[PDB]
Write a protein that binds this DNA or RNA. Sequence first.
RNA 1: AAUUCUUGGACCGGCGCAAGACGGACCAGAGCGAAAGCAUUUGCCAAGAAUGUUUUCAUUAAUCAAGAACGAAAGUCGGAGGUUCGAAGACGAUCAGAUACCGUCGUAGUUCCGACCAUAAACGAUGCCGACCGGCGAUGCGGCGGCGUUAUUCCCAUGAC
Lengths: 62, 101, 213, 356, 112, 136
Amino acid sequence: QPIKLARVTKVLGRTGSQGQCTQVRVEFMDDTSRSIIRNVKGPVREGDVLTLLESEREARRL
Amino acid sequence: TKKRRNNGRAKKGRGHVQPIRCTNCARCVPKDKAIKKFVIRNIVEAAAVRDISEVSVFDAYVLPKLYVKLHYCVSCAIHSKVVRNRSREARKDRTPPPRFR
Amino acid sequence: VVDPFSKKDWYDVKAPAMFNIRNIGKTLVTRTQGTKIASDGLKGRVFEVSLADLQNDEVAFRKFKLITEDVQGKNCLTNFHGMDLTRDKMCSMVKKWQTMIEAHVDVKTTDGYLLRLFCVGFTKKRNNQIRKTSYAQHQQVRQIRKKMMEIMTREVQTNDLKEVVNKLIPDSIGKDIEKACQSIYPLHDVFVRKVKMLKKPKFELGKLMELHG
Amino acid sequence: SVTVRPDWVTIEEMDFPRLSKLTLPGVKEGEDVLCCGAVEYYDKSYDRVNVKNEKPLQRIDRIFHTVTTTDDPVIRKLSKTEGNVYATDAILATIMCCTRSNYSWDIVIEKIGNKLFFDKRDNTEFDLLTVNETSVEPPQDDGNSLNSPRNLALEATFINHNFSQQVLKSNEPRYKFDEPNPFIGEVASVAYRYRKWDLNNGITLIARCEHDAVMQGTQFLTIKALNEWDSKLANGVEWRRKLDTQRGAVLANELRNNACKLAKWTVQALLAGSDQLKFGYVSRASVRDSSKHVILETQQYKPNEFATQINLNMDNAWGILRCIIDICMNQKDGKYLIMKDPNKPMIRLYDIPDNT
Amino acid sequence: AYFQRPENALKRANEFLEVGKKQPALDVLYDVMKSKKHRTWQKIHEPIMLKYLELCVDLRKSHLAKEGLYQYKNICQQVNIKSLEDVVRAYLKLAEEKTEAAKEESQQMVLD
Amino acid sequence: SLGPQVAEGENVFGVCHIFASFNDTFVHVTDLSGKETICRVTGGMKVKADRDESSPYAAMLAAQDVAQRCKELGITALHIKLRATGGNRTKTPGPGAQSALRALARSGMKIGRIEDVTPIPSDSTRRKGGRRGRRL
RNA sequence: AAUUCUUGGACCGGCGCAAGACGGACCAGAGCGAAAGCAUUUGCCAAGAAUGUUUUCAUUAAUCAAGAACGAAAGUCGGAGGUUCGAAGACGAUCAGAUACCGUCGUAGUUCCGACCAUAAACGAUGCCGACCGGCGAUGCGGCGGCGUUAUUCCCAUGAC
Ligand SMILES: [Mg+2]
Ligand SMILES: [Zn+2]
């Protein structure tokens, strides 16, 4: 599947077992309106880019 | 000592209400004593929906739901954490917990 | 050490003329090896097809049962057996704070077929209603149920099976009952929940081949 | 875009989900039949221009020819020689990345015999550059306001036509292909070259492809100018703040706000076969001053890398194009109109008399 | 809701007519014209309105053909007005033929 | 081994009965009739341990073998008839229901129409276990 | 996990047939009943509280030793029945032991008809009758007054708010 860019728009909350994954609201650079929720490792900032291997799957919001 | 006013049950002016089998055990609890719960669930959980949204023959077939009404005895309800113990003041609060999202 | 699907003929299934999409699908049978015959073993198979698939595209919650009452040649000819609403629909309708009214009539068509029709209807809450409940008193319930039976009998009794299926393809019976019971207590989610088949007349072929065009 | 008259017959309707699902493989290489015009050398020294060391954006008087398929003399010659689908880069860029379309746009199809002249309406707003089209809210301002969609698009078009020439060493010996520009010191730096695409399903495609300038390292440039007007209301981040820690963020944010404009510009360069597409970061003096501009920075992207980055699919672009050329090489002669539904996401196709 | 895919209204309308219930067949078509499905004129909106105004004539309900066209003129504004022209010409055309038949009926069979 | 349907567009439908108890999973394809069986791969045929007959894993293996086995006979698409145990017992499907339905969609089949067919009684016979339930 | 069931085709899918239980969801701090208790449809039989009344009799009333009717479940005797469940039993596990909790079968019983039995945390742990003493918003049955909405299009008049 083509690799697609999701842009962090608003960092929401921290998740995982040991508080290790930042759960972030992403706004797609490809489609104008589609905004999904993704679990992300490492430190992430409000207003930067992610390279998603799939642009359809969504993580369970808490 | 008297703990509840309505003796842990929603019977007031009957005398007898027919019993029900608990859905975890097969314990006989009266119909109104039991902790009832109505689970409306999608057949396919969370991610399976996307795979069956693409591998479907049809055009926007709103895949069906699963309606299951569950009666728990008080022990099964507390053990499964469907209910919990409460403060002497908070016990009287009958307004069910908010389900905003 | 015998491949059991080597001796299997596929047969195309045909629905009667009352539906848009004719052919339902395919059916497996064993080749006529010994005394027991493919077509005779194939005769009396019940196919439960959703009306969405049976028409082009519509309601998917109403299902029709169809019996392969005869085979002409590489073609199973099905005929109306029964009808049933889907679990999802029936479970979704039945909700708390209202009265559920159920009727059943044992009525016969002009030709041999004697059906058992089950009707269901739920008391509707008014547009400006502040009262939570919206229950019907027992006499209001059995006046509604008496009227349910009176329409359900009249609609079938006087015409033949080709036309009763033409009425069940929409829900003309349920819409007629719903409008009729507006004075007693306004119902809303009124359908003919289920149609059963108790008796058929002794099989004819000329009567089948009028239903198959 | 246009008021639709009661004499105009809707024949075909296509919505964006159906157009998004389209594909075509097997699209062959573009063959440079003709290369025309003269292109200047680019000063790579306008890239020592950052948030601290900016430049004045000056008015440059160079004449831009907005000549369509109808008025193209080479296409008029080539028409009888070979080709049955004639287009410009701006027109096919619109149809190709039609999926992102927000505002009302239109294309006049003219099927004279067994031909498709994908023509544009001269003296209609087709050669404007739209602004914050695909934001959370497009500018909801009135025609008399300065932050209006019309006035922002007006100045955005001006600064692009300014920037393309200003950055350029536009009085040092030009790179000449074969011919002078077929439209006429006074002129602007632009080169029009025509290309044949053999298109699988039995269509030959002759499109006019525009290079903006040449750079050494030789190299061909498609050059455009990104506008930032009043970020805080515009629903974007500020440019002047630092832009250096947040360059990738300032880019990706202005991309979503201008989803269709950046998609048309990038597929414009892929069409022409430009190996590099550059940009120009232009903002105002004060946030409500329409007259003044200052050039903050520029960044360069290879359009093949950029198109897979931002988002595009060549299969989609060529898959939508084969569909529309097939539709209008199927149905009858005369003037048509591919108009997109002003308020909803669906393109419509009307059949019209010989006049409008 | 009532419908997904607004062409299904025609199939319910057609299904009800084979039984001979043009009042609920009209109710079906009425429910679609006034709903979410206001997408600026789908190609299927003409056959819906053609059948709708045929049933409005056959039952003689002018005040419904009012509301029907009043919804239609809105959902086929400057997008395409040929649709209004074709529909309302075909409406008055259908009503004129019902009166032609109604006179000739009363004036040759019943007059004699 | 030859369903004579058209190679291009024609989908041949089966119907897959996914009986998912809380200590076994069945995946069972038949005719639209429901009379003639094509495949039946249980959760227990695949894995050899009693404690994981009702596994999402075992149900995933079972649906994969069913998908592969029915692709050869020329069943392209499937209708679905999911069920728990029912009667007096549980009416929530087993934990293998989801993984099986997912598995024969990951394995390149097409999904027609789905519905619960649990034996829901009007009112039933007395349930197993005493008046005081299953105490543990 | 094992006891148990099965290539003498179990479990699973399909079409039929028979039996004996039970009346899901709707079902509520709703209704009725002296209490125990009482729920699929329809018919027949007798009873009943409450409201309504400018009818009738005119103290006929309240509570009750003796005496009497009904009284869940289990239990007993005789007849019919035995689908599910299941005291004792028989084994399989668990454990130091387990005569238990967990499992597989399973007899009396569980169901109906006719005779006994007369006890329950039979509870509101709260005798029955009568009077007076704050407020508030619902709820079920009956009656009364009242803007308006709605179904009978034909609306008087009936239902639903
Ligand atoms: Mg009691
Ligand atoms: Zn329990």
